[PDB]
Amino acid sequence: GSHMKFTVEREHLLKPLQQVSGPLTLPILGNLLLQVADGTLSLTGTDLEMEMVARVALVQPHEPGATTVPARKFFDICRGLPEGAEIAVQLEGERMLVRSGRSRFSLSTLPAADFPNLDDWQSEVEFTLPQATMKRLIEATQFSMAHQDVRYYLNGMLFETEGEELRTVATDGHRLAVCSMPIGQSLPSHSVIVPRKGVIELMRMLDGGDNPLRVQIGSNNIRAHVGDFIFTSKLVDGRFPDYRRVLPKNPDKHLEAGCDLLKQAFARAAILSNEKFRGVRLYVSENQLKITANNPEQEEAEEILDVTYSGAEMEIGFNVSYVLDVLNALKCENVRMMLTDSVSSVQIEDAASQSAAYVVMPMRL
């Protein structure tokens, strides 16, 4: 195990190298851990909070061992080599040599023993689902996570198993997104908060393809297996809010309109909204929505849209970026807006599907 050596086709190394680099301050964190043992090359990248591992089968003679090498340089060398290149790698003293054709690269290393590992842990729940389902759950809610809120538990996404469904919840205290999907298995009840950087990396590993995703959840960690990749992240502490108590109770005013027409009207009104406050005013009346925006230069935008609405007239203010984020996430034919009054949240959803729901708190304009 002192003289690591392996030979691999470039085409078998490229996608694993790109993937493990995802989590990539401290010198060791800029390196990938390479480990060779009994027909497998393992490649690991970490940022101390999460780790990405890729397994590559070694079909050619190899010698066991381990080292760490600069990730970006190693990837760029392999990517820069011609299509079909054979890449021969070996440790030589404290340098890692990369050879292909008449190309030779000598890279600096840091000892494999110095590479930081996540603590040992035990899985409490396990389930398998299509990658497409996880992608849908994350994409439906990711934009509503907080970024650097003092309430740390909001800088991430809640993953919850309930009955036969997997659910995601994200909120920044102003707006909330919730999505749930049936995954054809009876599950125990569990709720964990995945850090926002972990949500982004989980999303990065979903290639759309038919390889299913296997999820393992512990008390303090989450792990996802997709093809030859294994992603592990620490979980966030704190009590995430309960979306069931955030959804507006008995909205008495239902508006329905085309998603694209509503989105384009908000997008044009936004041009003349205050750059800091982003406020727009909505006036709902019989089969009509009027959107108005003004800025400190007293420029004004006004949009009038035909909609389906027969409730009482009302005026309500919103941050237009929050409304546009919802409409951009819906990607559907028709949208339903469920209102109460000028000081209460609005619930927005696809008129044809209850799988996702969005809640936006108004502004006092």
């Binding site: 205290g173 102003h174 809010p241 955030v246 941050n319 949240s345 502004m363």
Partner: peptide, 6 residues
Amino acid sequence: QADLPL
């Protein structure tokens, strides 16, 4: 901006 009742 008003806060959601979290």
